[PDB]
Amino acid sequence: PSCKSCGAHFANTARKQTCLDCKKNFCMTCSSQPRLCLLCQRFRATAFQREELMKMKVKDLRDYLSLHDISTEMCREKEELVLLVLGQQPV
Ligand SMILES: [Zn+2]
Ligand SMILES: [Zn+2]
């Protein structure tokens, strides 16, 4: 077991933080506040508004989708990444 973000291990595996959104494990320093990792927290803040998502860095959109186990290998334009983020939004 290691942190999905920084790759580090835990001094006590029982203290690893599981993100409620992507469900991966993270450091306390790699998560915040509904315990969420920093990226999932950042995306929730956008309220999943297309315009706000479009302003996000390509790497963040790609990484966020990867954390949610969604492939972006067939995407050629940034808008496709945004559409995938919108598609997996919880309702
Ligand atoms: Zn997460
Ligand atoms: Zn970490």
Side-chain angles (χ1 to χ4, degrees):
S2 60
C3 179
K4 181 63 67 182
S5 183
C6 72
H9 284 57
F10 307 101
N12 190 313
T13 57
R15 294 166 180 167
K16 63 183 186 305
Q17 304 301 118
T18 303
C19 179
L20 189 63
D21 278 10
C22 65
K23 305 194 182 308
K24 305 311 178 184
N25 303 314
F26 304 82
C27 296
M28 181 68 76
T29 50
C30 290
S31 56
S32 66
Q33 212 166 122
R35 171 57 57 166
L36 303 173
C37 68
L38 303 184
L39 200 57
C40 286
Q41 186 72 277
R42 181 181 300 174
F43 276 70
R44 279 199 178 190
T46 69
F48 290 96
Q49 297 173 58
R50 62 172 286 80
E51 298 165 0
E52 297 296 338
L53 295 172
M54 190 62 68
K55 298 177 176 60
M56 300 293 277
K57 311 175 187 62
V58 173
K59 184 173 187 299
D60 290 336
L61 286 163
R62 198 166 188 295
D63 288 348
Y64 177 79
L65 288 169
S66 295
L67 287 177
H68 288 266
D69 301 304
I70 295 171
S71 60
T72 62
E73 54 181 359
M74 300 305 277
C75 300
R76 260 297 184 178
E77 303 194 320
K78 185 182 185 177
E79 179 162 55
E80 293 180 64
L81 298 174
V82 171
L83 285 169
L84 285 174
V85 172
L86 293 173
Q88 63 80 59
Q89 179 192 183
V91 291

